[PDB]
Amino acid sequence: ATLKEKLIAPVAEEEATVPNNKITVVGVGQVGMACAISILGKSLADELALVDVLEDKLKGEMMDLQHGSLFLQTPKIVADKDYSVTANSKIVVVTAGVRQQEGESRLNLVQRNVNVFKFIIPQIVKYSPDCIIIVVSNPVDILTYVTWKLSGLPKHRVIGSGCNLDSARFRYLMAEKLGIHPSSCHGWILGEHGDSSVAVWSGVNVAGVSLQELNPEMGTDNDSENWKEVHKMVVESAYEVIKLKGYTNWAIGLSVADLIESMLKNLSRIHPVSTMVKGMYGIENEVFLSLPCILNARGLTSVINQKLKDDEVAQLKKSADTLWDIQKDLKDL
Amino acid sequence: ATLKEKLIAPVAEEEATVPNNKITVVGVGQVGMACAISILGKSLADELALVDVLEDKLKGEMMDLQHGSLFLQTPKIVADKDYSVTANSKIVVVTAGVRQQEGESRLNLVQRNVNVFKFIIPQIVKYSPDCIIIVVSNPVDILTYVTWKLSGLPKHRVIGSGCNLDSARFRYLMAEKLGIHPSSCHGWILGEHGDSSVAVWSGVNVAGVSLQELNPEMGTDNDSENWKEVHKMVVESAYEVIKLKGYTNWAIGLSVADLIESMLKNLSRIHPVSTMVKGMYGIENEVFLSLPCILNARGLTSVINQKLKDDEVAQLKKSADTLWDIQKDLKDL
Amino acid sequence: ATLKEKLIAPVAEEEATVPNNKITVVGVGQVGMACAISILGKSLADELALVDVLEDKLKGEMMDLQHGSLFLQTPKIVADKDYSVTANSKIVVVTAGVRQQEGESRLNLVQRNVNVFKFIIPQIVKYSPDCIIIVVSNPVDILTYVTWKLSGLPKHRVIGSGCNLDSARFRYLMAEKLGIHPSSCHGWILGEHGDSSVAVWSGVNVAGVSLQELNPEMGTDNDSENWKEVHKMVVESAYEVIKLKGYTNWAIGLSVADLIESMLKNLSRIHPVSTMVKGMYGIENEVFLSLPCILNARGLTSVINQKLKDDEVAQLKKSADTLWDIQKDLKDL
Amino acid sequence: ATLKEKLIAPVAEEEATVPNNKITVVGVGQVGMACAISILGKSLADELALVDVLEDKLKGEMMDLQHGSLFLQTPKIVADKDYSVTANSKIVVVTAGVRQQEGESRLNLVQRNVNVFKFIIPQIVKYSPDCIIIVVSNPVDILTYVTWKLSGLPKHRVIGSGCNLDSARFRYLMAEKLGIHPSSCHGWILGEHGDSSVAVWSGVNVAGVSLQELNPEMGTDNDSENWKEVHKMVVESAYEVIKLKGYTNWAIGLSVADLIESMLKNLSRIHPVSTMVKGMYGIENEVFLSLPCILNARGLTSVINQKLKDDEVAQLKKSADTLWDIQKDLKDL
Ligand SMILES: NC(=O)C1=CN([C@@H]2O[C@H](COP(=O)(O)OP(=O)(O)OC[C@H]3O[C@@H](n4cnc5c(N)ncnc54)[C@H](O)[C@@H]3O)[C@@H](O)[C@H]2O)C=CC1
Ligand SMILES: NC(=O)C1=CN([C@@H]2O[C@H](COP(=O)(O)OP(=O)(O)OC[C@H]3O[C@@H](n4cnc5c(N)ncnc54)[C@H](O)[C@@H]3O)[C@@H](O)[C@H]2O)C=CC1
Ligand SMILES: NC(=O)C1=CN([C@@H]2O[C@H](COP(=O)(O)OP(=O)(O)OC[C@H]3O[C@@H](n4cnc5c(N)ncnc54)[C@H](O)[C@@H]3O)[C@@H](O)[C@H]2O)C=CC1
Ligand SMILES: NC(=O)C1=CN([C@@H]2O[C@H](COP(=O)(O)OP(=O)(O)OC[C@H]3O[C@@H](n4cnc5c(N)ncnc54)[C@H](O)[C@@H]3O)[C@@H](O)[C@H]2O)C=CC1
């Protein structure tokens, strides 16, 4: 006597189903929604859950995505301040907290976002004990460490976005120089996300041609190709976008969807994301820095061993000391 | 001597090139940027141009998109306040609009958007004489008429977003009720975008099964399936999203990229978009209302003829009267 | 130290993994390989298993797909005459058997397939007890019933290709007549695959406009648009392709990949596939005929009830009698 | 009143539109149809034209693809023995092959193809004066020269498949040793397609880590990883597939669709295809060999300069001498 009962005859008994490829995005700000629309555009989720503390914005974002359902392949979009909505996620993307603000210190940003992660991370693993967490919130290397400690997950299931976007920006800047697609330019930005990153000059190449062999002054102060400036522009181009539009979100959203594609399609592609690097390159503390990592359906299963130069190792160790000096004073992790 | 000279040997001489599939988005607000990221995600553009009056925000958006180039298939992303940047676009998406002032009247807000269009639309056609224009800006049926008048373009090359999003919402809400994908739920919202739209109950079907034959009280006040309430929610769900997050953008972005895909791939798919309906359903003035329209590489080349019911025709005629009453009082078109 | 040992440092311990979306194709003939290339081009499989009795052809097909891996997103392609290679498949596509030289179907021909399927189907469920089976082998409605009986699976997990391809050909022919994309042409070919199929004229529509309402003579000899001839061409166009190239494969490959996409993305999209229709439209025997069915991650979970005409119901009953006449004399089920 | 006249009201007058991204495949054999299905699956063509000398098989392949139209985004699929069908193609794929007689000199086999190509190639350029020609037919380096000479086209519009598939198989074999996606493996097979190709060991890398740096014996007769055997497997794996299934087609079809994607999307990606290499690496004759080439909408616009070792340059020069030894004796070019 219901329309649905006149129209639809069951062949299977209706039952509780669990999604096969559920993704949660925590924080529905600029970055969380760029992540959400990128995941939906690539059809990466059979179920998308959104969480924030702003219950009205959260409901509005959920409804706006639902209204686009005809154009997508995600049959369930749900949102709630309550983490019960996130249950049985395969991947949880954490974009929550506050951006850096002009006039505020790096310590200040650590205190604001560690406060947020202390509430969020235990809730995530309560409902999705088997998930992979992708940490995007800044400062990303500290917050990846904080996530690993609070989550109790194994290292291979806690991934910092780290230098993934730095590398994508570097390959774009190379591409601009040469007039070719960034996918045909190869080069790795590793270590700490942003100011103190390492450009691995020996690896920079097109079609396997070492650009450091063609220009041995690459990365020195006596270089007519000014590669040191290109490395600086990886950092400075982001600050410029932040000054101009207030934040960055589109490139980070696409880069997060690209990580998720590698994992849910079980591809074992190599990405410069952040992993726990104690015992690598002489690092003696528990810190997360970016190295070329293999990603697949298990998470971050392997790292590439590189022949890093003494100056490259020296920067990784100084980064590890800077991170550890902040981390050793964090309480209740 | 330059790295590029050492690395790259020309086979062809460098030459002045014209993009084959250039798209321009006018307005880099939350709607324009949802259009841009949806266009880029579907690889619909070999060149994307952005235009706005906010020079810094425009540059920041352009740079953020460029930083994501590794993940895309759009070799040229450009932005400027000067419409020369839009030259040789195949498709121009207009999302430009002003912010309401505190307590500003409703016909005043219309006149201010019309004054924006009096500058923008002649510039668009100056630089892209061969383009198709998609109008998204509100009020969308009026601003589609304005664009048509100011552009001097034939009616097959000016397309209002109209009820494209209203029909996507309808198919979502009917899909939610039935537990099926919205692509398997068929139903048309026509006429005026928003409050005065027409739900064509007689066409609402699943697998060619008329839901109105199953439930003959569909659309009436004596209906246990409350279909009139579903039509109400098509209108009200949009106001609710605006109340909750301040605006809508994700669904409109996806719907616009769906229209562009029909045109650039020359598919002749049918979409409920706004066209110039003088001479249809007893309408005797130049107004734009939504009907099922065939879209391909020439633009909007055909409309589907419906036998509409008396109440459905009455509402289209009342809508045409409302739009013409506003239009006949606009100057310098 | 192997290359792998110098180059790749483990983060996670090495472990076997169960694929999340493994597909098996049984039979690497023209149809089997069209299904495989369509499955791989849509990235629907994280593991693809191929089975055949021709060991050299099987290994050759496996290697040729593997050589294309750079261009795909399927990290494991395996092939063996032994069904152990098929373990833990979500979906198994059965294309094995004999194909028509021109076209027929009779008790003895089906007993030869039952002889083939009697070995294949128990092997499939032995290694993938939780799979969904898509039957493509002709005669497809009888062999869907045979697969169901031999498998012991519930009816929601055994799906016949049925009239999925017939309906696609119908929508192509409608599109050629009207000059619109087939996705904008709606029409359902139901019942038996091939000669005795039913064209549900009542459901044929563009944009919800009933073409039978514009032409109430549609499907009779009272008809100047000769829609009866379009239905004839759905049947004959297949025989014509077999005449001209020896077999058909591309359209069936694409249509099978479309069914798989609905199920692995859990979409609940509606397709005209073959299901067990005992107790529908007065059918009294266990036979498989095509109706509009909902497909998702559970398999075929529902059927759409339609307001079918007396002559359409007579045809389903006669088809049922025809299939039951054959099945009742099959042995070793 | 035709059905179409009652249903569809023109907004623009009906007009003949020149397709924007038309592709022609010459030869509808195993390789041609692999190219066609990959082109269609990636939505690269608004019009696909097929040409062959076998009228029935050509028409059958055309009809089978048309019957899959619902599942594609190519609104026009055409086929004819007459090259008029190919008019206004952006790209033409040549897979047309005569088979070598079992007591036949290599000069005779190529002259047999020249007698065929002497009709095909002029006919292609007559109907598509602006086209890019991709030559797939074996022997591929000689036939690319023949195509260039007969076409009158500049070097940048004639592309030999060359070592494109050799490099894809090399990356697959690297990837199988490491358990990673072939896209994360980098290595270049250059020069002559097949037995005499050059593996550029100095460019073989993962994440910019030189495998020759890790193993300086890479490619020598004192090599514990036996990379010489991996290079042999690149050649031999193809002969193995021919022995096992009669031919290769799937990997070649995916590789051609990837080249087409670079050019139609104007990406300037680098591919190891065959270009006219007179005046490079001391080569003094008009021959085609594979180098890393930049592909975009103009065709092959640029080549990457490598620092090749003396033994690599000597092999390029030898290959050039072998090709020129045959070409100098060809008549009617
Ligand atoms: N790793 C990288 O490469 C990049 C990192 N980011 C970082 O991503 C983060 C997000 O940036 P935006 O989205 O622009 O910020 P935003 O201010 O637009 O969004 C942050 C959201 O987090 C929510 N939030 C705050 N506390 C929360 C809690 N306890 N639980 C749940 N949600 C909570 C807020 O309500 C807000 O909606 C920042 O830390 C930013 O620095 C941004 C760009 C790139
Ligand atoms: N038709 C539909 O279904 C929908 C229509 N819309 C409409 O889309 C429009 C855009 O909305 P939002 O992005 O949220 O607004 P917004 O105010 O955030 O962005 C509009 C942009 O237009 C720019 N603009 C103003 N004057 C300009 C000029 N002369 N040239 C170029 N750009 C100029 C502004 O600087 C601003 O960046 C509005 O009219 C909105 O109502 C909104 C959603 C759905
Ligand atoms: N349902 C539909 O809409 C369509 C159905 N078909 C049917 O698909 C089937 C396959 O046709 P084609 O691929 O053209 O035939 P084919 O002869 O090219 O391939 C059949 C393959 O099955 C293999 N095979 C036979 N017995 C086997 C066994 N016991 N175990 C494993 N493999 C076995 C053969 O060795 C061969 O490789 C036929 O029954 C054909 O009529 C084809 C077109 C459309
Ligand atoms: N470069 C590479 O890496 C690869 C190249 N190939 C080559 O591709 C070619 C095609 O191989 P298959 O498709 O397996 O052969 P096939 O024999 O299956 O198909 C060849 C087709 O060309 C047609 N043809 C012959 N002469 C013609 C003419 N004058 N005009 C038009 N069509 C004509 C034939 O009728 C036939 O349909 C061969 O030369 C083969 O060696 C094969 C795979 C890899």
mmCIF file with all atom_site columns, C-alpha atoms in Angstrom, chain A residues 19-142:
data_model
loop_
_atom_site.group_PDB
_atom_site.id
_atom_site.type_symbol
_atom_site.label_atom_id
_atom_site.label_alt_id
_atom_site.label_comp_id
_atom_site.label_asym_id
_atom_site.label_entity_id
_atom_site.label_seq_id
_atom_site.pdbx_PDB_ins_code
_atom_site.Cartn_x
_atom_site.Cartn_y
_atom_site.Cartn_z
_atom_site.occupancy
_atom_site.B_iso_or_equiv
_atom_site.pdbx_formal_charge
_atom_site.auth_seq_id
_atom_site.auth_comp_id
_atom_site.auth_asym_id
_atom_site.auth_atom_id
_atom_site.pdbx_PDB_model_num
ATOM 1   C CA . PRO A 1 19  ? 30.554 -0.322 3.423   1.00 0.00 ? 19  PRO A CA 1
ATOM 2   C CA . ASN A 1 20  ? 33.588 -1.731 1.635   1.00 0.00 ? 20  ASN A CA 1
ATOM 3   C CA . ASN A 1 21  ? 35.396 1.641  1.079   1.00 0.00 ? 21  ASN A CA 1
ATOM 4   C CA . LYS A 1 22  ? 34.127 4.168  3.635   1.00 0.00 ? 22  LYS A CA 1
ATOM 5   C CA . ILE A 1 23  ? 36.083 7.443  4.013   1.00 0.00 ? 23  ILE A CA 1
ATOM 6   C CA . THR A 1 24  ? 35.647 9.981  6.856   1.00 0.00 ? 24  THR A CA 1
ATOM 7   C CA . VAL A 1 25  ? 36.792 13.612 6.558   1.00 0.00 ? 25  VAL A CA 1
ATOM 8   C CA . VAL A 1 26  ? 37.195 15.328 9.981   1.00 0.00 ? 26  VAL A CA 1
ATOM 9   C CA . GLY A 1 27  ? 36.949 19.112 9.594   1.00 0.00 ? 27  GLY A CA 1
ATOM 10  C CA . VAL A 1 28  ? 34.674 20.523 6.849   1.00 0.00 ? 28  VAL A CA 1
ATOM 11  C CA . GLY A 1 29  ? 36.634 23.760 6.301   1.00 0.00 ? 29  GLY A CA 1
ATOM 12  C CA . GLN A 1 30  ? 38.405 24.845 3.109   1.00 0.00 ? 30  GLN A CA 1
ATOM 13  C CA . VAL A 1 31  ? 40.758 21.811 3.036   1.00 0.00 ? 31  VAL A CA 1
ATOM 14  C CA . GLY A 1 32  ? 38.248 19.193 4.298   1.00 0.00 ? 32  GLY A CA 1
ATOM 15  C CA . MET A 1 33  ? 35.665 20.124 1.578   1.00 0.00 ? 33  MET A CA 1
ATOM 16  C CA . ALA A 1 34  ? 38.395 20.230 -1.181  1.00 0.00 ? 34  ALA A CA 1
ATOM 17  C CA . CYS A 1 35  ? 39.340 16.695 0.056   1.00 0.00 ? 35  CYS A CA 1
ATOM 18  C CA . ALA A 1 36  ? 35.640 15.674 0.085   1.00 0.00 ? 36  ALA A CA 1
ATOM 19  C CA . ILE A 1 37  ? 34.874 16.910 -3.472  1.00 0.00 ? 37  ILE A CA 1
ATOM 20  C CA . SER A 1 38  ? 38.156 15.314 -4.811  1.00 0.00 ? 38  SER A CA 1
ATOM 21  C CA . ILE A 1 39  ? 37.340 11.913 -3.179  1.00 0.00 ? 39  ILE A CA 1
ATOM 22  C CA . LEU A 1 40  ? 33.727 12.089 -4.578  1.00 0.00 ? 40  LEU A CA 1
ATOM 23  C CA . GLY A 1 41  ? 34.924 13.163 -8.084  1.00 0.00 ? 41  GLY A CA 1
ATOM 24  C CA . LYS A 1 42  ? 37.257 10.120 -8.289  1.00 0.00 ? 42  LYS A CA 1
ATOM 25  C CA . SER A 1 43  ? 34.456 7.766  -6.964  1.00 0.00 ? 43  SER A CA 1
ATOM 26  C CA . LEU A 1 44  ? 36.829 6.623  -4.149  1.00 0.00 ? 44  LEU A CA 1
ATOM 27  C CA . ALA A 1 45  ? 34.157 6.198  -1.395  1.00 0.00 ? 45  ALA A CA 1
ATOM 28  C CA . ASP A 1 46  ? 31.055 3.974  -1.276  1.00 0.00 ? 46  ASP A CA 1
ATOM 29  C CA . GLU A 1 47  ? 30.236 5.963  1.923   1.00 0.00 ? 47  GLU A CA 1
ATOM 30  C CA . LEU A 1 48  ? 31.529 9.424  2.944   1.00 0.00 ? 48  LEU A CA 1
ATOM 31  C CA . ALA A 1 49  ? 31.181 10.593 6.580   1.00 0.00 ? 49  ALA A CA 1
ATOM 32  C CA . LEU A 1 50  ? 31.860 14.235 7.595   1.00 0.00 ? 50  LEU A CA 1
ATOM 33  C CA . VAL A 1 51  ? 32.567 15.449 11.192  1.00 0.00 ? 51  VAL A CA 1
ATOM 34  C CA . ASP A 1 52  ? 33.068 18.980 12.555  1.00 0.00 ? 52  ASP A CA 1
ATOM 35  C CA . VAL A 1 53  ? 32.108 20.932 15.723  1.00 0.00 ? 53  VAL A CA 1
ATOM 36  C CA . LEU A 1 54  ? 30.087 23.472 13.607  1.00 0.00 ? 54  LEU A CA 1
ATOM 37  C CA . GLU A 1 55  ? 26.817 21.439 13.412  1.00 0.00 ? 55  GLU A CA 1
ATOM 38  C CA . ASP A 1 56  ? 25.053 23.926 11.055  1.00 0.00 ? 56  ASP A CA 1
ATOM 39  C CA . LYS A 1 57  ? 27.961 24.229 8.550   1.00 0.00 ? 57  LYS A CA 1
ATOM 40  C CA . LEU A 1 58  ? 28.401 20.425 8.760   1.00 0.00 ? 58  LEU A CA 1
ATOM 41  C CA . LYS A 1 59  ? 24.710 19.736 7.856   1.00 0.00 ? 59  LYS A CA 1
ATOM 42  C CA . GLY A 1 60  ? 24.851 22.348 5.027   1.00 0.00 ? 60  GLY A CA 1
ATOM 43  C CA . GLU A 1 61  ? 27.989 20.732 3.484   1.00 0.00 ? 61  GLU A CA 1
ATOM 44  C CA . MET A 1 62  ? 26.429 17.224 3.795   1.00 0.00 ? 62  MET A CA 1
ATOM 45  C CA . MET A 1 63  ? 23.204 18.417 2.031   1.00 0.00 ? 63  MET A CA 1
ATOM 46  C CA . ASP A 1 64  ? 25.103 20.300 -0.730  1.00 0.00 ? 64  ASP A CA 1
ATOM 47  C CA . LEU A 1 65  ? 27.127 17.128 -1.554  1.00 0.00 ? 65  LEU A CA 1
ATOM 48  C CA . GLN A 1 66  ? 23.933 14.970 -1.381  1.00 0.00 ? 66  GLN A CA 1
ATOM 49  C CA . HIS A 1 67  ? 22.237 17.373 -3.874  1.00 0.00 ? 67  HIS A CA 1
ATOM 50  C CA . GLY A 1 68  ? 25.086 16.527 -6.347  1.00 0.00 ? 68  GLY A CA 1
ATOM 51  C CA . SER A 1 69  ? 24.462 12.699 -5.903  1.00 0.00 ? 69  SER A CA 1
ATOM 52  C CA . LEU A 1 70  ? 23.067 12.305 -9.437  1.00 0.00 ? 70  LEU A CA 1
ATOM 53  C CA . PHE A 1 71  ? 26.575 13.298 -10.770 1.00 0.00 ? 71  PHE A CA 1
ATOM 54  C CA . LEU A 1 72  ? 28.521 11.024 -8.353  1.00 0.00 ? 72  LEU A CA 1
ATOM 55  C CA . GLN A 1 73  ? 28.941 7.309  -7.428  1.00 0.00 ? 73  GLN A CA 1
ATOM 56  C CA . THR A 1 74  ? 28.736 7.548  -3.615  1.00 0.00 ? 74  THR A CA 1
ATOM 57  C CA . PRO A 1 75  ? 25.384 6.174  -2.415  1.00 0.00 ? 75  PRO A CA 1
ATOM 58  C CA . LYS A 1 76  ? 25.712 7.234  1.262   1.00 0.00 ? 76  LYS A CA 1
ATOM 59  C CA . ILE A 1 77  ? 26.837 10.706 2.487   1.00 0.00 ? 77  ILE A CA 1
ATOM 60  C CA . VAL A 1 78  ? 26.399 11.220 6.275   1.00 0.00 ? 78  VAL A CA 1
ATOM 61  C CA . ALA A 1 79  ? 27.503 13.897 8.756   1.00 0.00 ? 79  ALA A CA 1
ATOM 62  C CA . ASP A 1 80  ? 27.357 14.384 12.531  1.00 0.00 ? 80  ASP A CA 1
ATOM 63  C CA . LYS A 1 81  ? 29.353 15.925 15.391  1.00 0.00 ? 81  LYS A CA 1
ATOM 64  C CA . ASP A 1 82  ? 29.070 12.376 16.938  1.00 0.00 ? 82  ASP A CA 1
ATOM 65  C CA . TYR A 1 83  ? 31.861 9.981  15.757  1.00 0.00 ? 83  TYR A CA 1
ATOM 66  C CA . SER A 1 84  ? 29.319 7.064  15.644  1.00 0.00 ? 84  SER A CA 1
ATOM 67  C CA . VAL A 1 85  ? 28.707 8.382  12.045  1.00 0.00 ? 85  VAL A CA 1
ATOM 68  C CA . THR A 1 86  ? 32.363 7.428  11.191  1.00 0.00 ? 86  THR A CA 1
ATOM 69  C CA . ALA A 1 87  ? 32.102 3.700  12.224  1.00 0.00 ? 87  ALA A CA 1
ATOM 70  C CA . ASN A 1 88  ? 34.008 1.205  9.966   1.00 0.00 ? 88  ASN A CA 1
ATOM 71  C CA . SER A 1 89  ? 35.886 3.836  7.927   1.00 0.00 ? 89  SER A CA 1
ATOM 72  C CA . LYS A 1 90  ? 38.801 2.389  5.888   1.00 0.00 ? 90  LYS A CA 1
ATOM 73  C CA . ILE A 1 91  ? 40.516 5.818  5.713   1.00 0.00 ? 91  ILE A CA 1
ATOM 74  C CA . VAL A 1 92  ? 40.058 8.854  8.000   1.00 0.00 ? 92  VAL A CA 1
ATOM 75  C CA . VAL A 1 93  ? 41.401 12.195 6.739   1.00 0.00 ? 93  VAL A CA 1
ATOM 76  C CA . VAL A 1 94  ? 42.040 14.726 9.555   1.00 0.00 ? 94  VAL A CA 1
ATOM 77  C CA . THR A 1 95  ? 41.851 18.385 8.364   1.00 0.00 ? 95  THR A CA 1
ATOM 78  C CA . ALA A 1 96  ? 40.448 19.773 11.689  1.00 0.00 ? 96  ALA A CA 1
ATOM 79  C CA . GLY A 1 97  ? 41.782 22.631 13.787  1.00 0.00 ? 97  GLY A CA 1
ATOM 80  C CA . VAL A 1 98  ? 42.855 26.163 12.912  1.00 0.00 ? 98  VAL A CA 1
ATOM 81  C CA . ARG A 1 99  ? 45.225 27.481 10.220  1.00 0.00 ? 99  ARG A CA 1
ATOM 82  C CA . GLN A 1 100 ? 48.270 29.504 11.266  1.00 0.00 ? 100 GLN A CA 1
ATOM 83  C CA . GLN A 1 101 ? 47.411 33.203 11.733  1.00 0.00 ? 101 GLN A CA 1
ATOM 84  C CA . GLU A 1 102 ? 49.748 36.198 11.075  1.00 0.00 ? 102 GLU A CA 1
ATOM 85  C CA . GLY A 1 103 ? 51.312 37.373 14.356  1.00 0.00 ? 103 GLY A CA 1
ATOM 86  C CA . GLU A 1 104 ? 51.047 33.911 16.037  1.00 0.00 ? 104 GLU A CA 1
ATOM 87  C CA . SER A 1 105 ? 54.100 31.649 16.828  1.00 0.00 ? 105 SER A CA 1
ATOM 88  C CA . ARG A 1 106 ? 54.737 28.014 15.670  1.00 0.00 ? 106 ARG A CA 1
ATOM 89  C CA . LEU A 1 107 ? 54.471 26.928 19.378  1.00 0.00 ? 107 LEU A CA 1
ATOM 90  C CA . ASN A 1 108 ? 51.015 28.647 19.473  1.00 0.00 ? 108 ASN A CA 1
ATOM 91  C CA . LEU A 1 109 ? 49.825 26.591 16.483  1.00 0.00 ? 109 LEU A CA 1
ATOM 92  C CA . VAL A 1 110 ? 51.131 23.361 18.185  1.00 0.00 ? 110 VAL A CA 1
ATOM 93  C CA . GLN A 1 111 ? 49.152 24.180 21.380  1.00 0.00 ? 111 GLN A CA 1
ATOM 94  C CA . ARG A 1 112 ? 45.868 25.023 19.492  1.00 0.00 ? 112 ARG A CA 1
ATOM 95  C CA . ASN A 1 113 ? 45.876 21.916 17.240  1.00 0.00 ? 113 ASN A CA 1
ATOM 96  C CA . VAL A 1 114 ? 47.257 19.402 19.804  1.00 0.00 ? 114 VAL A CA 1
ATOM 97  C CA . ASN A 1 115 ? 44.280 20.485 22.003  1.00 0.00 ? 115 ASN A CA 1
ATOM 98  C CA . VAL A 1 116 ? 41.934 19.580 19.055  1.00 0.00 ? 116 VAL A CA 1
ATOM 99  C CA . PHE A 1 117 ? 43.691 16.230 18.301  1.00 0.00 ? 117 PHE A CA 1
ATOM 100 C CA . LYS A 1 118 ? 43.463 15.152 21.971  1.00 0.00 ? 118 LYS A CA 1
ATOM 101 C CA . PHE A 1 119 ? 39.611 15.115 21.546  1.00 0.00 ? 119 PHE A CA 1
ATOM 102 C CA . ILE A 1 120 ? 39.425 13.852 17.883  1.00 0.00 ? 120 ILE A CA 1
ATOM 103 C CA . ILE A 1 121 ? 41.975 10.985 17.573  1.00 0.00 ? 121 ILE A CA 1
ATOM 104 C CA . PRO A 1 122 ? 40.622 8.718  20.408  1.00 0.00 ? 122 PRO A CA 1
ATOM 105 C CA . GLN A 1 123 ? 37.060 9.146  18.944  1.00 0.00 ? 123 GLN A CA 1
ATOM 106 C CA . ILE A 1 124 ? 38.329 8.109  15.456  1.00 0.00 ? 124 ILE A CA 1
ATOM 107 C CA . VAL A 1 125 ? 39.901 4.823  16.651  1.00 0.00 ? 125 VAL A CA 1
ATOM 108 C CA . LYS A 1 126 ? 36.914 4.014  18.972  1.00 0.00 ? 126 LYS A CA 1
ATOM 109 C CA . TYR A 1 127 ? 34.597 3.694  15.919  1.00 0.00 ? 127 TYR A CA 1
ATOM 110 C CA . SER A 1 128 ? 37.183 2.638  13.264  1.00 0.00 ? 128 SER A CA 1
ATOM 111 C CA . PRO A 1 129 ? 39.913 0.621  15.105  1.00 0.00 ? 129 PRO A CA 1
ATOM 112 C CA . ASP A 1 130 ? 41.131 -0.843 11.723  1.00 0.00 ? 130 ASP A CA 1
ATOM 113 C CA . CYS A 1 131 ? 41.313 2.480  9.746   1.00 0.00 ? 131 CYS A CA 1
ATOM 114 C CA . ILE A 1 132 ? 44.302 4.272  8.150   1.00 0.00 ? 132 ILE A CA 1
ATOM 115 C CA . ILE A 1 133 ? 44.577 7.911  9.297   1.00 0.00 ? 133 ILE A CA 1
ATOM 116 C CA . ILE A 1 134 ? 45.879 10.589 6.879   1.00 0.00 ? 134 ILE A CA 1
ATOM 117 C CA . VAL A 1 135 ? 46.964 13.661 8.882   1.00 0.00 ? 135 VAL A CA 1
ATOM 118 C CA . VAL A 1 136 ? 46.690 16.979 6.991   1.00 0.00 ? 136 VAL A CA 1
ATOM 119 C CA . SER A 1 137 ? 46.303 19.573 9.852   1.00 0.00 ? 137 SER A CA 1
ATOM 120 C CA . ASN A 1 138 ? 49.399 21.766 10.554  1.00 0.00 ? 138 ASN A CA 1
ATOM 121 C CA . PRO A 1 139 ? 51.935 21.560 11.920  1.00 0.00 ? 139 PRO A CA 1
ATOM 122 C CA . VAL A 1 140 ? 51.676 18.260 10.034  1.00 0.00 ? 140 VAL A CA 1
ATOM 123 C CA . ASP A 1 141 ? 54.863 16.404 11.206  1.00 0.00 ? 141 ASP A CA 1
ATOM 124 C CA . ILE A 1 142 ? 54.126 17.132 14.915  1.00 0.00 ? 142 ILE A CA 1
#
